[PDB]
Ligand binder design. Structure first.
Ligand SMILES: CCCCCCCCCCCCC(=O)O[C@@H](COC(=O)CCC)COP(=O)(O)O[C@H]1[C@H](O)[C@@H](O)[C@@H](O)[C@@H](O)[C@@H]1O
Ligand code: NA
Lengths: 577, 80, 80
């Protein structure tokens, strides 16, 4: 059924790492006809397909047993590609890369990986890929979970494997190998939210001759307390497939450490530098142009004609020429924002949930433009209702100005606090409030069906007035069920003020250094997105966003060639040697 | 932030209704400001041609203004 | 409301010869970092006299640790 052999049974059932049956079975296999097909026996059931004796030896941490298995000619490139050993985590399983080298690496067994790479009989292929296209480094990235001990052992194993691979194959660049999705280990770590691995990779130093070129952090010069270091920006700002900033900024909002991954040492200063060099002036220019657009729109709408039945004839006086010019400019701006919204939605392809849980401002600007277009259509159709649509554009046009509070730290954080308070707390309050309002409105309309309480709309407005301090408890009318009406109104007022008090108290549970920290990180992420969009637009056919220049870091690769890497300078001071 | 919101809604209200306490920007700004201090006017006893659109604007303004006030009050407790 | 004794009893492990049947928490299998465990659930879900869940839920509110006794490892997962 499963294909289990006597060898696998002996491998599974042993005590203290020893079972003399294994050696006897191997000797009998040698003497009978051959050992090759016996030692390399493996399961055939799809749930455990591909597993052989080497995997069991590695799992049980038995060095002598795996050494014997390799000595007898065991295949060290077998793929344990059963359903148990892969993703689709709807069931028990453990994905490790399907290969014995990846299995030893992922279980923190350094001696076994060293033996597998540097044995006398059959060395392992360090560059091999599994069914998904993942190398050993991709597997190491996959098994990370950002805890302390996990990060420690994964980092150490990653460093050791990289150094050994450099020594055995000086011409091999392991970190450039991509899986089926086109992701390198750095891109995979960045997009998956593996902050501990990213923080190691981006600023690693390897102080060992003949493999110093593997480092990404160097030292340009040193004085006494002060010294200057260089950070490599290869595939950080531009990569032509997937840069770190691109995969962090444009993630799908489900990455666990989406906000925190921008706080590592090189990226924060890189984004601040990009902001300070060229992006700030363009942002302020766009803000100014939007302000001019809104002033012209407001002035044009203010002086509309009051005659009925549009369209209106153009007169020969000056004010009408200015008015029609303003109308034309407003409609042009609406068309511009309409096309920009379409371009965003087509170029990003949001997944029907990323539309609303993120990117609100795109929706708001698009809705403003839709109102403008509906106003135009009604204007030329000889309808007077266009004014209504126009004003719903105009009011929105002012509130959308809050978009430009980013670029200023305090106002940006304040706006982020506003947005989160709306999206988290108000939605819960309004549901309960509307339930109470509708219930008491129906009761009041039923009790009194005349005199300002003959409909649900009027009664709802009259009860809403009580919530804003504009109520009416005079009781001058001669109702049939007065003294029952009074009890209902008093109960409604008391319950509504209990609800308001409870809301106010509940909102204090966010000022425990909770929102204060989540904001400023959300603001930094927003400004990062703005920087990336501005760079991608660039408005001039100019792409001079590069950093400190083609500096020479080491200049001595394993070959005679010298290397240049577009580094970023950081100067530091330390008064404790 | 409050002044930006007030100016925007005042211009919208003057444009929608051009007579009867809403024929100037100063008067409309005062009338909308009265809501913030609990002295508003939601009687709707006049015969405006754009009634029932005016109500929606006033309700939206009131809700947004109280959102801003709540956000201020909560945010200012981070200094305590 | 003896939280400590309940927490001990519900997940005790006795690994010794001739008396391991006294355990209520067992190990089904172990891969490397991953493994699977089994909880007994005898007289937790139903026993027709006094189950743990019925006793905790329908207490008279004078029990000290009425809220915390449902946070022990098997009961929270069972209820979810
Ligand atoms: C006439 C009636 C008028 C009604 C107007 C109603 C208020 C207008 C307010 C205008 C503010 C414009 C704006 O700036 O939009 C705000 C949110 O808008 C709202 O509150 C909508 C309320 C519905 C920011 O959204 P943002 O596009 O920055 O997305 C954020 C990411 O960038 C970030 O990384 C985080 O992932 C974050 O979780 C994301 O949100
Ligand atoms: Na009042």
């Amino acid at each position: 059924e499963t294909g289990k052999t006597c060898l696998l049974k002996a491998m599974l059932n042993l005590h203290n790492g020893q079972n003399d049956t294994i050696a006897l079975l191997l000797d009998v296999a040698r003497k009978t006809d051959s050992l090759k097909q016996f030692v390399n026996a493996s399961y055939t059931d799809s749930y455990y397909k591909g597993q052989t004796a080497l995997h069991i030896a590695i799992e049980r941490r038995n060095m002598t047993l795996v050494t014997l298995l390799v000595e007898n000619g065991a295949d060290v490139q077998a793929a344990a590609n059963g359903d148990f050993f892969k993703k689709t985590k709807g069931r028990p399983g453990f994905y490790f890369g399907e290969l014995p080298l990846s299995l030893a690496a992922c279980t923190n067994q350094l001696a076994i990986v060293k033996f597998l790479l540097q044995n006398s009989w059959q060395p392992a292929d360090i560059s091999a890929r599994d069914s998904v296209g993942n190398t050993v480094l991709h597997a190491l990235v996959e098994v990370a979970d950002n805890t302390v001990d996990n990060t420690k052992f994964v980092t150490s194993m990653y460093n050791e494997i990289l150094i050994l691979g450099a020594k055995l194959h000086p011409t091999l660049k392991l970190e450039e190998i991509t899986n089926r999705k086109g992701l390198t280990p750095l891109a995979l770590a960045a997009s998956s939210g593996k902050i501990g691995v990213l923080a190691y990779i981006l600023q690693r130093e390897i102080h060992e001759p003949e493999c110093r070129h593997l480092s990404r952090k160097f030292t340009e010069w040193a004085y006494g307390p002060v010294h200057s270091s260089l950070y490599d920006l290869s595939c950080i700002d531009t990569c032509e497939k997937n840069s770190v900033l691109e995969v962090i900024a444009y993630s799908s909002s489900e990455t666990p450490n989406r906000h925190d991954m921008l706080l590592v040492e090189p990226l924060n200063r890189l984004l601040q530098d990009k902001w300070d060099r060229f992006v700030k002036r363009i942002f302020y220019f766009n803000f100014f142009v939007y302000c001019l657009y809104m002033i012209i729109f407001t002035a044009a709408a203010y002086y509309r004609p009051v005659e009925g039945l549009p369209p209106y004839k153009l007169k020969n006086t000056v004010g009408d020429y200015f008015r029609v010019t303003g109308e034309i400019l407003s409609v042009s701006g609406g068309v511009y924002f309409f096309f920009r919204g379409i371009q965003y939605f087509l170029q990003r392809r949001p997944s029907l949930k990323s539309l609303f849980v993120d990117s609100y401002s795109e929706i708001l600007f698009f809705v403003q433009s839709l109102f403008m277009l509906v106003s135009v259509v009604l204007y030329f159709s000889q309808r007077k209702e266009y004014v209504a649509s126009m004003v719903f554009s105009l009011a929105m046009g002012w509130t959308n100005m809050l978009y430009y509070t980013r670029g200023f730290q305090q106002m940006g954080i304040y706006a982020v606090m506003i947005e989160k308070m709306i999206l988290r707390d108000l939605c819960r309050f309004m549901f309960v409030y509307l339930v109470f309002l509708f219930g008491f409105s129906t009761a009041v309309v039923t009790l009194i069906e005349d005199g300002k309480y003959n409909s649900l709309y009027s009664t709802c407005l009259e009860l809403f007035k009580f919530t804003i301090g504009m109520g009416d408890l005079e009781f001058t009318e001669n109702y049939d069920f007065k003294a029952v009406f009074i009890i209902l109104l008093l109960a409604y007022v008391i319950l509504t003020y209990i609800l308001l008090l409870n809301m106010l108290i509940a909102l204090m549970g966010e000022t425990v250094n909770k929102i204060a920290q989540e904001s400023k990180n959300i603001w930094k992420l927003q400004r990062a997105i703005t920087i990336l969009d501005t760079e991608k637009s660039f408005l001039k056919c100019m792409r001079k966003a590069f950093r400190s220049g083609k500096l020479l870091q080491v200049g001595f690769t394993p070959d005679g060639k010298d290397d240049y890497r577009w580094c970023f300078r950081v100067d530091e001071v330390n008064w404790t040697t």
